[PDB]
Design a protein around this ligand. Structure first.
Ligand SMILES: [Mg+2]
Ligand SMILES: [Mg+2]
Ligand SMILES: [Mg+2]
Ligand SMILES: [Mg+2]
Ligand SMILES: [Mg+2]
Ligand SMILES: [Mg+2]
Ligand SMILES: [Mg+2]
Ligand SMILES: [Mg+2]
Ligand SMILES: [Mg+2]
Ligand SMILES: [Mg+2]
Ligand SMILES: [Mg+2]
Ligand SMILES: [Mg+2]
Ligand SMILES: [Mg+2]
Ligand SMILES: [Mg+2]
Ligand SMILES: [Mg+2]
Ligand SMILES: [Mg+2]
Ligand SMILES: [Mg+2]
Ligand SMILES: [Mg+2]
Ligand SMILES: [Mg+2]
Ligand SMILES: [Mg+2]
Ligand SMILES: [Mg+2]
Ligand SMILES: [Mg+2]
Ligand SMILES: [Mg+2]
Ligand SMILES: [Mg+2]
Ligand SMILES: [Mg+2]
Ligand SMILES: [Mg+2]
Ligand SMILES: [Mg+2]
Ligand SMILES: [Mg+2]
Ligand SMILES: [Mg+2]
Ligand SMILES: [Mg+2]
Ligand SMILES: [Mg+2]
Ligand SMILES: [Mg+2]
Ligand SMILES: [Mg+2]
Ligand SMILES: [Mg+2]
Ligand SMILES: [Mg+2]
Ligand SMILES: [Mg+2]
Ligand SMILES: [Mg+2]
Ligand SMILES: [Mg+2]
Ligand SMILES: [Mg+2]
Ligand SMILES: [Mg+2]
Ligand SMILES: [Mg+2]
Ligand SMILES: [Mg+2]
Ligand SMILES: [Mg+2]
Ligand SMILES: [Mg+2]
Ligand SMILES: [Mg+2]
Ligand SMILES: [Zn+2]
Lengths: 127, 97, 83, 206, 23, 60, 61
RNA sequence: CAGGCCUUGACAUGCUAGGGAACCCGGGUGAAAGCCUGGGGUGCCCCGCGAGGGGAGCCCUAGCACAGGUGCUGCAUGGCCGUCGUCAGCUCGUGCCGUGAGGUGUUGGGUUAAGUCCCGCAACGAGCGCAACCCCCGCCGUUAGUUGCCAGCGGUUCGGCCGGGCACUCUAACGGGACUGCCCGCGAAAGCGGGAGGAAGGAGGGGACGACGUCUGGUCAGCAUGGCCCUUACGGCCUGGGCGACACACGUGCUACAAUGCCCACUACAAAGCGAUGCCACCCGGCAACGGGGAGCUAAUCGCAAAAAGGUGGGCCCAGUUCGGAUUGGGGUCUGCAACCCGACCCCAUGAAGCCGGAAUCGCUAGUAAUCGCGGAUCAGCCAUGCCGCGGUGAAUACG
């Protein structure tokens, strides 16, 4: 009755719950389209069940905190990609080549002293 | 019967979390195992040289780790045997109702 | 400006100097270092020597310069322009 | 000048602190100043004893200063009278119940802080600085050390043109964290200025 | 702009509060 | 003008607004941290010696 | 509220007053330098106007 | 810097003599410092029904020994740091060559981020370096379950709020994990090209870490320290000023010149930090800065806190403007003994230059640049648009 996955990206963690349903998606009490309203990168969070034509075969009850709106989008995209294969392992192939089952570890490189940011350096002047 | 453990070295802080919990587990019964709270880091960032070499620094920090310890059922066979305990130097015990 | 929940500031030691003069039929030359003491109506007609860091400049106090501080009238830097 | 302190670099991996205790922000500095006032007194008095490391522990209005030393009999004195001549003068500036302990150092030539003090005194006594280094690095190696390195910087032999001299035997991996490298510095004051004496004792990897 | 103190944007810049940026 | 300024700093002043921190170790007036009583230089010398409880060269 | 001309006349009257008594702000408005604590070693151009470039001290060859 | 003051001195250990005090509350003059002052009342072991006489923490006046100097020399120095350069290098021991400096090794063929490794070789090894061991980030596991979390039944004033649970998220300690280990191909080998598994692949990303030396590099003003120098003054106390000056010139930055923008209202999503004359919930006064009340929190609990760009709705319509926010007038607020020189903030008004910048010139190869905001150290306050950190959104391009 329940198939869960954990999705993590950039200081943003996401608990996604895949359950049988019509297609209704929810994220932290609000509706999906109400919580990512107008954020045109929304649709990408649901590509895992577009790689396996279950786009309406589930209802997702999802929880996100940390990071930002987009940091919570790929947090979902990995989690639902995990919860899906946790519903059936054969989904791994065709999900691994789409980079889905992999967590991209691109984080904010720390600030470093003698600089303005991570690598942005103070302006050089030779006199 | 609650114990919270502070200390700069976490190795002494953590070793004294078993040497406390296991005492109240000798005078039973119910104990709530050593929970770790978030650490509080006091950062110090210092110009490396004594003079004018501003873009070279060296980082330092003072880590104050934190552990929580709960004993549910007192039973004074510990209210005596905890006062008789041997906890290392760099650690603060603080016990609440 | 100074929070008027508090008073108008005069260093007191300067304020004595002027209220004695009024009482005794003023005026003597008053030399003070309190550049901060607010010009206060009990000062009009007198002349205070204000120390600007080097000298005591005389300052004849008139009614139209009351809300001010004494230092405002003894400038501290001499200029004269550049060559 | 570029190299990092081999103790501060290993603090937590090979070197424990010389002062160990916890103190919330409200009085860290006070226990710290006290710690420094103690070390100042003992490093002065216990100089002729061969002081190598002052351990200062602290818990609850009491303090346990532990002095590692070459000649413990010098610190204690007559049957524990000169020892308690300090155990109370310590507590006169401690106020706390200032417990004092004395530890025997197994090998003096294996203690970097002492080697440096030995060579520092040998220059103050006008010995040959070049010879005085090669002699010390020799003793550390005979005492089983896996490598040693000793350095004199300053007006060697009173030369107007100051200079740096050194010698090293075995190996001294300053870049290795698991290397246990005892480090000790001493200052040599002479009539023509001051001299710096650095000692590196590779004890072994762990 | 951030330099305009009389705006909800310039008050964020100086980190202060007022009629032009209340709490 | 130094030692008489180590002294004047310890003393209680004519007005609490006239008090300034000095390094307890070396007497420096600038870059003295409240937590240690030490300037940014002595902070580095004692740190490396290990005579500063629980402080460790940071790295992240 | 008072507007256009009268406001300018009352603004002018207060500057004039500060210049007349000789207070430090009055000397600022005279010589044409800033009045509210700003440094003048560099900018102050709004108050000083276009730059008046002069010659400088020289090196040695 | 000016003026008013101190002279064993603000500070150290020592010696005396006279007081014989210890310490706390005043007073006159003065800008203060200072100088002149006025009170009470010291135990220590003593002889005590006596005068008390001594002596002693510590005080104070005279006299000295001495203090004191951010005065000079970084070209007399230690320590620490910058730099070349995280560049791949610098050398030693024995043997061999050479009259000798010195060479060999360390050169050569190949390979690597690397004196990395391989093969060769009158060389054979070794050391300092490189790498590694260490810290953060990325996946999984164990161990823990409050102050953290809420998957599923019960309530539920509809707040994980209560029962209850620790599954998850997290929090923080110990572990696992990647090594060219595997396949195809090349190669003598080290290795290199690709594949598979895998969260991660060729050193995963970032840190810490900086060889022998160079630059008579930098710092006697952090400290230390030789020498030279001053001694009712080159020491010391104070008040005021100056370090903030302004015909000029340069560096580093902030804010912008607008519509991919500006403005108001509504509405989402962070991280790392700080917080007991501290952070301040909420409450009323106030256009506001703030003020008065006033809970909670020795803080995974209470607070700083709103994150901002963003999303929605609406307004401006190409103007030196609803761009920009300098300058100036007035009115306040607050910290502070005190905001004249010389504070920060708030409100009314004022609303400059600036239409994308000559010659010239800087940074960045990816979660980087760019842009958005947030916190901390110093700190009464603050001239922070600086620095050290933190996450949010997130490119372009490398033929060579
Ligand atoms: Mg994390
Ligand atoms: Mg960023
Ligand atoms: Mg800089
Ligand atoms: Mg001599
Ligand atoms: Mg505007
Ligand atoms: Mg000094
Ligand atoms: Mg101050
Ligand atoms: Mg200070
Ligand atoms: Mg100025
Ligand atoms: Mg010179
Ligand atoms: Mg030098
Ligand atoms: Mg030097
Ligand atoms: Mg110089
Ligand atoms: Mg070379
Ligand atoms: Mg040879
Ligand atoms: Mg020849
Ligand atoms: Mg020969
Ligand atoms: Mg040779
Ligand atoms: Mg070479
Ligand atoms: Mg060679
Ligand atoms: Mg070479
Ligand atoms: Mg050659
Ligand atoms: Mg390299
Ligand atoms: Mg070879
Ligand atoms: Mg568990
Ligand atoms: Mg390394
Ligand atoms: Mg030089
Ligand atoms: Mg000197
Ligand atoms: Mg000096
Ligand atoms: Mg210019
Ligand atoms: Mg700037
Ligand atoms: Mg510029
Ligand atoms: Mg704030
Ligand atoms: Mg205009
Ligand atoms: Mg124009
Ligand atoms: Mg406008
Ligand atoms: Mg004004
Ligand atoms: Mg001011
Ligand atoms: Mg235009
Ligand atoms: Mg341009
Ligand atoms: Mg690069
Ligand atoms: Mg912008
Ligand atoms: Mg501050
Ligand atoms: Mg200003
Ligand atoms: Mg800031
Ligand atoms: Zn210091």
């Amino acid at each position: 009755e329940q198939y869960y996955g954990t999705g993590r990206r950039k200081e943003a963690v996401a608990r996604v719950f895949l359950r049988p349903g019509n297609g209704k998606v929810t994220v932290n009490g609000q509706d999906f389209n109400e919580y990512f309203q107008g954020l045109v990168r929304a649709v990408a969070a649901l590509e895992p069940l577009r790689a396996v034509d279950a786009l309406g075969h589930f209802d997702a009850y999802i929880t996100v905190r940390g990071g930002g709106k987009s940091g919570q989008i790929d947090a979902i995209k990995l989690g639902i990609a995990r919860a899906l294969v946790q519903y059936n392992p054969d989904y791994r192939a065709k999900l691994k080549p789409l980079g889905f089952l992999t967590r991209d570890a691109r984080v904010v490189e720390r600030k470093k002293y003698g600089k303005h940011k991570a690598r942005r350096a103070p302006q050089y002047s030779k006199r | 019967i609650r114990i919270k453990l502070r200390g700069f070295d976490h190795k002494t802080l953590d070793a004294s979390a078993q040497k406390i919990v296991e005492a109240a587990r000798r005078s039973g019964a119910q104990v709530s195992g050593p929970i770790p709270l978030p650490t509080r880091v006091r950062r110090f960032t210092v110009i490396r040289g004594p003079f004018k070499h501003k873009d070279s620094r060296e980082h330092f920090e003072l880590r104050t780790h934190n552990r929580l310890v709960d004993i549910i059922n007192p039973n004074r066979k510990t209210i005596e045997q905890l006062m008789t305990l041997d906890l290392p130097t760099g650690v603060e015990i603080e016990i609440k109702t | 400006p100074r929070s008027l929940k508090k008073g108008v500031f005069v260093d007191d030691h300067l304020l004595e100097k002027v209220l004695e003069l009024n009482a005794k039929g003023e005026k003597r030359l008053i030399k003070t270092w309190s550049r901060r003491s607010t010009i206060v109506p009990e000062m009009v007609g007198h002349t205070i020597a204000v120390y600007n860091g080097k000298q005591h400049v005389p300052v004849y106090i008139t009614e139209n310069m009351v809300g001010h501080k004494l230092g405002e009238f003894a400038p501290t830097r001499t200029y004269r322009g550049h060559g | 000048g570029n190299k990092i302190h081999p103790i501060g670099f290993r603090l937590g991996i090979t070197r424990d602190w010389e002062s160990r205790w916890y103190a919330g922000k409200k009085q860290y500095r006070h226990l710290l100043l006290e710690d420094q006032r103690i070390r100042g007194l003992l490093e002065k008095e216990l100089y002729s004893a061969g002081l190598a490391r002052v351990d200062i522990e602290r818990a609850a209005d009491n303090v346990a200063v532990t002095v590692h030393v070459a000649k413990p009999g010098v610190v204690i004195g007559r049957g524990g009278e000169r020892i308690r001549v300090l155990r109370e003068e310590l507590a006169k500036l401690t106020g706390k119940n200032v417990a004092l302990n004395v530890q025997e150092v197994q090998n003096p030539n294996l203690s970097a802080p002492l080697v440096a003090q030995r060579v520092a005194e040998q220059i103050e006594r006008r010995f040959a600085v070049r010879r005085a280094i090669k002699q010390a690095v020799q003793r550390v190696m005979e005492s089983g050390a896996k490598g040693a390195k000793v350095i004199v910087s300053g007006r060697i032999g009173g030369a107007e043109q100051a200079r740096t001299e050194w010698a090293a035997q075995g190996r001294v991996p300053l870049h290795t964290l698991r290397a246990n490298i005892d480090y000790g510095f001493a200052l040599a004051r002479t009539t023509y200025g001051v001299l710096g004496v650095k000692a590196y004792i590779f004890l072994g990897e762990v | 702009g951030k330099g305009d103190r009389r705006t909800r944007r310039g008050k964020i810049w100086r980190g202060t509060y007022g009629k032009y940026r209340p709490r | 003008a130094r030692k008489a300024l180590i002294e004047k700093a310890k003393r209680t002043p004519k007005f609490k607004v006239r008090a300034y921190t000095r390094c307890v170790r070396c007497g420096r007036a600038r870059s003295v941290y409240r937590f240690f009583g030490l300037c940014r230089i002595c902070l580095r010398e004692l740190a490396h010696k290990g005579q500063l409880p629980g402080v460790r060269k940071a790295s992240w | 509220w008072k507007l256009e001309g009268e406001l300018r006349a009352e603004v002018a009257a207060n500057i004039k007053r500060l210049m007349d008594i000789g207070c430090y702000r009055g000397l600022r408005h005279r010589r044409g330098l800033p009045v509210r604590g700003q440094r003048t070693r560099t900018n102050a151009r709004t108050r000083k106007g276009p730059r008046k470039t002069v010659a400088g001290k020289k090196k040695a060859p």
